[PDB]
JSON list of C-alpha atoms in Angstrom, two decimals:
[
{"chain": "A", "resi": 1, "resn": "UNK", "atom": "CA", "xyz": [12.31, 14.03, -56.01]},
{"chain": "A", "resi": 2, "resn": "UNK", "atom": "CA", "xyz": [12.67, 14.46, -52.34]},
{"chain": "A", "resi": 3, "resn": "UNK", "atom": "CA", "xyz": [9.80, 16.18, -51.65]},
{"chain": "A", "resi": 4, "resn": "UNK", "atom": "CA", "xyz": [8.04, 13.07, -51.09]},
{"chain": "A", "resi": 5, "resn": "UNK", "atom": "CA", "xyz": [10.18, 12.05, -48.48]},
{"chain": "A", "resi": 6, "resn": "UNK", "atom": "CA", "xyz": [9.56, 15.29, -46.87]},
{"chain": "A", "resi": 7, "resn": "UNK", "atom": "CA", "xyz": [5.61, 14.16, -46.44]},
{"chain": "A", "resi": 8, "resn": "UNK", "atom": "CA", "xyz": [6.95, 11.37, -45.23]},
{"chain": "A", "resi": 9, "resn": "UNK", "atom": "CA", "xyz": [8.71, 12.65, -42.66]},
{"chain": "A", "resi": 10, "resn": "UNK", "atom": "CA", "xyz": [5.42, 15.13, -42.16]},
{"chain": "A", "resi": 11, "resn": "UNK", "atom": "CA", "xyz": [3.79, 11.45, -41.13]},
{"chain": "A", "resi": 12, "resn": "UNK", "atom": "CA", "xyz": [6.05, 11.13, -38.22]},
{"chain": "A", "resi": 13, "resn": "UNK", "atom": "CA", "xyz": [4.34, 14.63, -37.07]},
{"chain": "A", "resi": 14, "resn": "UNK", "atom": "CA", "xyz": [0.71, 12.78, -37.57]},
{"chain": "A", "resi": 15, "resn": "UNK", "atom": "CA", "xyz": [2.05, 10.43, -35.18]},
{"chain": "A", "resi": 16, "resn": "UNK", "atom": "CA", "xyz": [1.27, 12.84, -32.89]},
{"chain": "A", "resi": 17, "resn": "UNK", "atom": "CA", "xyz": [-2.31, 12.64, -30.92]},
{"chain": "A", "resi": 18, "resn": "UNK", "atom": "CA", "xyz": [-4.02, 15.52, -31.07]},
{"chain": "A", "resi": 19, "resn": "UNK", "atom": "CA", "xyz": [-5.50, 17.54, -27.70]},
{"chain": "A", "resi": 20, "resn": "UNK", "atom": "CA", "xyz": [-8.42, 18.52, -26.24]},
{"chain": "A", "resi": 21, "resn": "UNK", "atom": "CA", "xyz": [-9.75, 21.68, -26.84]},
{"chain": "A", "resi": 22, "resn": "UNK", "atom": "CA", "xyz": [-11.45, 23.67, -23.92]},
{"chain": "A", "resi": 23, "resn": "UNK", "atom": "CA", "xyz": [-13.09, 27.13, -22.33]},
{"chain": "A", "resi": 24, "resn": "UNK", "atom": "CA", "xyz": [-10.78, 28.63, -19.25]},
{"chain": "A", "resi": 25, "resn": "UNK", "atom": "CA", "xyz": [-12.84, 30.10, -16.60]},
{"chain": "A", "resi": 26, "resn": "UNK", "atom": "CA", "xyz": [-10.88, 32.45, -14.57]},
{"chain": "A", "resi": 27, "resn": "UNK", "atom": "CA", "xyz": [-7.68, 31.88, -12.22]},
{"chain": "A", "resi": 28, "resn": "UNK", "atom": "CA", "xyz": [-7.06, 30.90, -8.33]},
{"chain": "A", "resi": 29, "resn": "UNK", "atom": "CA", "xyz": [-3.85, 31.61, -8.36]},
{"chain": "A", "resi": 30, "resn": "UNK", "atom": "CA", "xyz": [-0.99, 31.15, -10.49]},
{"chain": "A", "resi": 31, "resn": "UNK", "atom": "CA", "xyz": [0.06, 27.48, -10.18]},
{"chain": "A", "resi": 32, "resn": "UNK", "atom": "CA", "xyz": [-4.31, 26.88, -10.67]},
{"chain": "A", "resi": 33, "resn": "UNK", "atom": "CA", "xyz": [-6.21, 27.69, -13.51]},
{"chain": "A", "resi": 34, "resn": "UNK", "atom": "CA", "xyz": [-9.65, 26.36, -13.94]},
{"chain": "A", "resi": 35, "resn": "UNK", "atom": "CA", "xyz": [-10.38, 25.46, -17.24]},
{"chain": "A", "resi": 36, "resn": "UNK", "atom": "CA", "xyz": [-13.87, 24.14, -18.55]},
{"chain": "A", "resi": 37, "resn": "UNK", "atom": "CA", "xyz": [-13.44, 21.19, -22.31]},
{"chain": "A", "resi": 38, "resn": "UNK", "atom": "CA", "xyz": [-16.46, 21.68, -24.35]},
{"chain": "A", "resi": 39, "resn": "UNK", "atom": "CA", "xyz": [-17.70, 18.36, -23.08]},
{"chain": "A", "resi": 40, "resn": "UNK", "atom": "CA", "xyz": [-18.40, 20.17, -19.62]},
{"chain": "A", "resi": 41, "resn": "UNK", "atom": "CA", "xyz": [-16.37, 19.02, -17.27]},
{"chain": "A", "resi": 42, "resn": "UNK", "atom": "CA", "xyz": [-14.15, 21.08, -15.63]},
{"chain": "A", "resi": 43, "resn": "UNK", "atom": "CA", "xyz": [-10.36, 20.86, -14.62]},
{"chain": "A", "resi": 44, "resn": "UNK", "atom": "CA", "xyz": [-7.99, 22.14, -11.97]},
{"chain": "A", "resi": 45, "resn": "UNK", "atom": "CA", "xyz": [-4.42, 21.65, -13.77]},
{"chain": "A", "resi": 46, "resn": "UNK", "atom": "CA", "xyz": [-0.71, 23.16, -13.72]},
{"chain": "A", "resi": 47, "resn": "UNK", "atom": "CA", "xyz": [0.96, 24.68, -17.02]},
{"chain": "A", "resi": 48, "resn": "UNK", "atom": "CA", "xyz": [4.22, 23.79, -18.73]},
{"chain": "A", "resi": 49, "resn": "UNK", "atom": "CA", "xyz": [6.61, 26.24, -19.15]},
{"chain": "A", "resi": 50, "resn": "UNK", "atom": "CA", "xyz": [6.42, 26.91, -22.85]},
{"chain": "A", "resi": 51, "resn": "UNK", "atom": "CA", "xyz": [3.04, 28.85, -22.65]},
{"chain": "A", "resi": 52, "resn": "UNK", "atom": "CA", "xyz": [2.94, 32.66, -22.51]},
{"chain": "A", "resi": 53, "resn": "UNK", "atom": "CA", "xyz": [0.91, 35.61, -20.74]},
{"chain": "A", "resi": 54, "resn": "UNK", "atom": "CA", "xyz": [-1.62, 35.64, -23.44]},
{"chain": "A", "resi": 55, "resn": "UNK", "atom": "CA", "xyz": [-2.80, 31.70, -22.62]},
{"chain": "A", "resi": 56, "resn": "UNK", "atom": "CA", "xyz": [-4.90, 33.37, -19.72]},
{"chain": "A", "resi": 57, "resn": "UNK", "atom": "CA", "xyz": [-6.93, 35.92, -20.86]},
{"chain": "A", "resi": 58, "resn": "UNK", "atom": "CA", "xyz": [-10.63, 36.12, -19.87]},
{"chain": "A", "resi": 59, "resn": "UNK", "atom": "CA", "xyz": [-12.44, 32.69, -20.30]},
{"chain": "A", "resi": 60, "resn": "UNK", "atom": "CA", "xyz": [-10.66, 32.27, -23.89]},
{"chain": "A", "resi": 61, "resn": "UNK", "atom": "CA", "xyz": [-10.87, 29.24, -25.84]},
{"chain": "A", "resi": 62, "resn": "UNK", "atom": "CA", "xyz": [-7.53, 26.67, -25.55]},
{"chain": "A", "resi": 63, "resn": "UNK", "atom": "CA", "xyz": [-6.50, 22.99, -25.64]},
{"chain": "A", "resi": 64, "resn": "UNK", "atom": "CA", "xyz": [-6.01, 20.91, -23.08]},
{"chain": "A", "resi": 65, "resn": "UNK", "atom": "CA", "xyz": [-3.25, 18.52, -22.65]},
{"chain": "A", "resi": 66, "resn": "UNK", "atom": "CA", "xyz": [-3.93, 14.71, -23.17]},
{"chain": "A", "resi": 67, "resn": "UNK", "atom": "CA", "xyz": [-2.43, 13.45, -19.94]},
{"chain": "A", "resi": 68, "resn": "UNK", "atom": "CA", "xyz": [-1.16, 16.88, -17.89]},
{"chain": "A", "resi": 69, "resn": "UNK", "atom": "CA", "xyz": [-4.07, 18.70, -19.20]},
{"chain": "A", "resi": 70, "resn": "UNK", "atom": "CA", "xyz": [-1.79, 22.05, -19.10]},
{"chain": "A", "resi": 71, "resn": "UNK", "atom": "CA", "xyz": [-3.00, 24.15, -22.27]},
{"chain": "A", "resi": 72, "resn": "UNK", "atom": "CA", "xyz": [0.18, 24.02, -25.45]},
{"chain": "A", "resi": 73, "resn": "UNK", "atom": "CA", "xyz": [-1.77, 26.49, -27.81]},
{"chain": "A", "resi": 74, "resn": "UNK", "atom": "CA", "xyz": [-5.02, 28.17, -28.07]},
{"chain": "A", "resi": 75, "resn": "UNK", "atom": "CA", "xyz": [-6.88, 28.04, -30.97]},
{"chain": "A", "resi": 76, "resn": "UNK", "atom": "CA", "xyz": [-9.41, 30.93, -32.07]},
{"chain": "A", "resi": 77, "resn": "UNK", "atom": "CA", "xyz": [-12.85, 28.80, -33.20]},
{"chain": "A", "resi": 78, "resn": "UNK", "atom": "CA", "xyz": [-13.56, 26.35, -35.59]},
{"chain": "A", "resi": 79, "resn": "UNK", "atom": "CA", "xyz": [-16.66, 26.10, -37.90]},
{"chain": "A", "resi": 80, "resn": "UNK", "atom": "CA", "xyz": [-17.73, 23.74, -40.46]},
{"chain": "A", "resi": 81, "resn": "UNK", "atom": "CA", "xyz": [-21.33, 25.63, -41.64]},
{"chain": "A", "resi": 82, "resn": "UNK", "atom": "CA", "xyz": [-19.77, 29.08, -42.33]},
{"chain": "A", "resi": 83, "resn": "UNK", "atom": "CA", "xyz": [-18.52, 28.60, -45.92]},
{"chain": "A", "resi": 84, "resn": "UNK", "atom": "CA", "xyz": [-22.27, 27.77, -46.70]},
{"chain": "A", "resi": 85, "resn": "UNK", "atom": "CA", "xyz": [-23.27, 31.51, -45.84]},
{"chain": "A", "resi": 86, "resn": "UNK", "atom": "CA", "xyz": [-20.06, 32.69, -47.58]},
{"chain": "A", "resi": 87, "resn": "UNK", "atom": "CA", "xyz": [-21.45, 32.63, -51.17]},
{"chain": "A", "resi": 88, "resn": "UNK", "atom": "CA", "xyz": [-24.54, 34.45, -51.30]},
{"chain": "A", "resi": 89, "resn": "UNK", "atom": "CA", "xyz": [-24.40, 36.97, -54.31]},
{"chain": "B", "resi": 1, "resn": "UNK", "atom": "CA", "xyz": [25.81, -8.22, 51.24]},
{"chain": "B", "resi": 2, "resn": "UNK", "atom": "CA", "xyz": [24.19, -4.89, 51.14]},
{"chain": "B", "resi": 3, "resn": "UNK", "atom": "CA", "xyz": [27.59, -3.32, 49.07]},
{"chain": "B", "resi": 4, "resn": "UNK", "atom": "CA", "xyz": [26.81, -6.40, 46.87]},
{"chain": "B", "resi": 5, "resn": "UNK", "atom": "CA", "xyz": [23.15, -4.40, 45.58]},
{"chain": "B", "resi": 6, "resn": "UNK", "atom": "CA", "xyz": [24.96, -1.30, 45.61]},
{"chain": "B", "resi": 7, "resn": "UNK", "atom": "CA", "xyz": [27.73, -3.18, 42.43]},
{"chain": "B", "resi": 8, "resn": "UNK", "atom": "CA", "xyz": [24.24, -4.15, 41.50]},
{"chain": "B", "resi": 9, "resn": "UNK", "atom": "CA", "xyz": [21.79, -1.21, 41.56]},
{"chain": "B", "resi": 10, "resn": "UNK", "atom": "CA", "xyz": [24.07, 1.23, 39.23]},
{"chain": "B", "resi": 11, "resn": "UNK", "atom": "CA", "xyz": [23.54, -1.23, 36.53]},
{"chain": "B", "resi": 12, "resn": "UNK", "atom": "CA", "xyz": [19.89, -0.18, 35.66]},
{"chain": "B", "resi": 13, "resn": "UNK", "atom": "CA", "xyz": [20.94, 3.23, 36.80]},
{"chain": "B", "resi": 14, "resn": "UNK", "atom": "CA", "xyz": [23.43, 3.22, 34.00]},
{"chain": "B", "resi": 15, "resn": "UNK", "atom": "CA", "xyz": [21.42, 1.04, 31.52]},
{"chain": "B", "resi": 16, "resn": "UNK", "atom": "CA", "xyz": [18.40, 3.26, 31.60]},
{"chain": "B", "resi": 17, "resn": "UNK", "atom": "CA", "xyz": [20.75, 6.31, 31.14]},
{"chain": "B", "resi": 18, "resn": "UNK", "atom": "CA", "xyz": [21.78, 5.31, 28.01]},
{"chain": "B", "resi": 19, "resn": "UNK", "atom": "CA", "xyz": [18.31, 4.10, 27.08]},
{"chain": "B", "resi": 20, "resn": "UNK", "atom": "CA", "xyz": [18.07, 8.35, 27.75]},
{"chain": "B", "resi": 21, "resn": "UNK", "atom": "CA", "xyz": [20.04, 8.57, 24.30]},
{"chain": "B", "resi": 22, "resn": "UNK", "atom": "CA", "xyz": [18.27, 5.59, 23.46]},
{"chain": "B", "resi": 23, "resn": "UNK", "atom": "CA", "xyz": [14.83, 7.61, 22.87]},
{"chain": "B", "resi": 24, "resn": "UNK", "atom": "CA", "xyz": [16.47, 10.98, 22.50]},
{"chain": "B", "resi": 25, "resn": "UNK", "atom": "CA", "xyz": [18.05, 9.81, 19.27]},
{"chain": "B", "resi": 26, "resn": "UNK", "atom": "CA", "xyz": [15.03, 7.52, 18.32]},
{"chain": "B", "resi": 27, "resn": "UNK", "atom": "CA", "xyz": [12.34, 10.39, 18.51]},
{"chain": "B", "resi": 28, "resn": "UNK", "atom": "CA", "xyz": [13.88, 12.95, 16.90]},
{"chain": "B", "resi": 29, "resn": "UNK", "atom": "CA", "xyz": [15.11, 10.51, 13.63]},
{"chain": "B", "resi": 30, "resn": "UNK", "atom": "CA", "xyz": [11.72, 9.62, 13.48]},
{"chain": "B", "resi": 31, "resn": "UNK", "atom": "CA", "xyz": [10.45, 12.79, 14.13]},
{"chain": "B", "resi": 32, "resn": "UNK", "atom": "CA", "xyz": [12.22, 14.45, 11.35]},
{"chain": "B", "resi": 33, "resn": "UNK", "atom": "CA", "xyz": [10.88, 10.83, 9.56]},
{"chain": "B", "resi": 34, "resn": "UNK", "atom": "CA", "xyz": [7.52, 12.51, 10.56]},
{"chain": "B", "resi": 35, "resn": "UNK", "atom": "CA", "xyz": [8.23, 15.42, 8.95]},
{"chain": "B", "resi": 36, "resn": "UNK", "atom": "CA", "xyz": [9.37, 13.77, 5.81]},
{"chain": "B", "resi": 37, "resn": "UNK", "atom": "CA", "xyz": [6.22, 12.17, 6.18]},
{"chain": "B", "resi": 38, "resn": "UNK", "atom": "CA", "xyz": [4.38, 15.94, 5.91]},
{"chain": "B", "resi": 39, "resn": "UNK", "atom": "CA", "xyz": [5.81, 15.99, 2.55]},
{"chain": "B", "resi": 40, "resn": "UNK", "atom": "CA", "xyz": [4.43, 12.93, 1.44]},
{"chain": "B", "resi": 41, "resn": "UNK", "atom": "CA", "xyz": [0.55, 13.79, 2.32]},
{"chain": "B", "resi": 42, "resn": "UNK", "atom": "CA", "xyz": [1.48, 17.21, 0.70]},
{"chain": "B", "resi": 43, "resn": "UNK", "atom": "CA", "xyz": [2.99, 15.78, -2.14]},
{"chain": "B", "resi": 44, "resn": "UNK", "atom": "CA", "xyz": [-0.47, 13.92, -3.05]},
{"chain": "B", "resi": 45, "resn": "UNK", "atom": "CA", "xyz": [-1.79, 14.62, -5.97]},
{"chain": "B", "resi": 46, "resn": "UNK", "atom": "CA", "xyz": [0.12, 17.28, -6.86]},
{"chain": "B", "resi": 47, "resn": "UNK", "atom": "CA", "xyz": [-1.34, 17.75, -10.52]},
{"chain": "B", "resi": 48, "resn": "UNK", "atom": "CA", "xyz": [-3.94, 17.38, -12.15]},
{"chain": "B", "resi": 49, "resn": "UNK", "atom": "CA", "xyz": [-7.10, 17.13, -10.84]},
{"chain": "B", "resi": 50, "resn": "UNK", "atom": "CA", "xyz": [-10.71, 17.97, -11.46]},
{"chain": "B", "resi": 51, "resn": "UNK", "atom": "CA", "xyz": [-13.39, 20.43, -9.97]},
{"chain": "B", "resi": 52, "resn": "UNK", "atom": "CA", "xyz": [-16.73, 18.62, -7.90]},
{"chain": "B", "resi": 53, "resn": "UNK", "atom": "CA", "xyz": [-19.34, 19.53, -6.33]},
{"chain": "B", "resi": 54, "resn": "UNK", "atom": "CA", "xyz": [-19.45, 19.26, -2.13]},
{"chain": "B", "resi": 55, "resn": "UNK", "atom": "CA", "xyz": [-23.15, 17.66, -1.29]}
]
C-alpha cells in the first residue's frame, strides 16, 4: 500500500546528478590532492569534510565532485563485458 | 610689520603639523588597507583548479 510511495520518495533521491568518476595520482600536501577523471584531464581540488583516511590511498579509483570536484565516495570498478565470461561450463 | 609675518608664519608651521597626523594616520589605514589587500590576491582562486603544462 505504501510501498509505492516509498519509490516515490526514492525519485526525489534520482533527483540527484550523479558525479564524475576519476584516478587520484598521489598528494602535495594535505589541502592538494591531484586527481586524474578517466577523460584525462587532471585536477588540483580541496576535500569536504565527510571523506575518510582511506579516500587517499595509492592512485585508487574515486568520484569527483560536480562543481567542488572534492571526491564523496570511491567506487571499486565497473564492467559491463564480464558477465559474458561468467557462464562458460 | 615684521611681528605681523611672525602672527603669520606659525600658521603653515602649525597647518603642516597637523598635516604630520594628516599622513601618519592616512598611511598606516591604508597600509593595513594594503594588507587587507594581501588577502585578497591570496584569497584568489582558492579552490578548485586544474593541472597545465608550463611551455
Amino acid at each position: 500500500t505504501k510501498q509505492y510511495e516509498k519509490s516515490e520518495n526514492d525519485l526525489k533521491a534520482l533527483q540527484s546528478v550523479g558525479q564524475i568518476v576519476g584516478e587520484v595520482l598521489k598528494q602535495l600536501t594535505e589541502e592538494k590532492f591531484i586527481v586524474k577523471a578517466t577523460n584525462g584531464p587532471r585536477y588540483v581540488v580541496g576535500c569536504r569534510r565527510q571523506l575518510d583516511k582511506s579516500k587517499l590511498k595509492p592512485g585508487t579509483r574515486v568520484a569527483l565532485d560536480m562543481t567542488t570536484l572534492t571526491i564523496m565516495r570511491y567506487l571499486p570498478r565497473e564492467v559491463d563485458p564480464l558477465v559474458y565470461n561468467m557462464s562458460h561450463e | 610689520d615684521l611681528y605681523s609675518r611672525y602672527k603669520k608664519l606659525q600658521q603653515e608651521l602649525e597647518f603642516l603639523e597637523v598635516q604630520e597626523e594628516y599622513i601618519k594616520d592616512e598611511q598606516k589605514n591604508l597600509k593595513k588597507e594594503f594588507l587587507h589587500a594581501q588577502e585578497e590576491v591570496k584569497r584568489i582562486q582558492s579552490i578548485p583548479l586544474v593541472i597545465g603544462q608550463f611551455l
